[PDB]
Copies of this chain bind each other. A is one copy, B any other.
Amino acid sequence: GNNQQNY
């Protein structure tokens, strides 16, 4: 699906 990664 869609990807959002927050570091």
Contacts and interface: CB of A to CB of B under 8 A. Distances in A.
Copies in the complex: 18
Interface string A1-7: 1111111
Contacts of A1: 1-3, 6
A6 to B, nearest CB: 5
Nearest to A2: B1
Contacts of A5: 3-7
A7 B3 CA distance: 14
Contacts of A3: 1-5
8 contacts: A1-B6, A2-B2, A3-B3, A3-B4, A3-B5, A4-B4, A4-B5, A6-B7
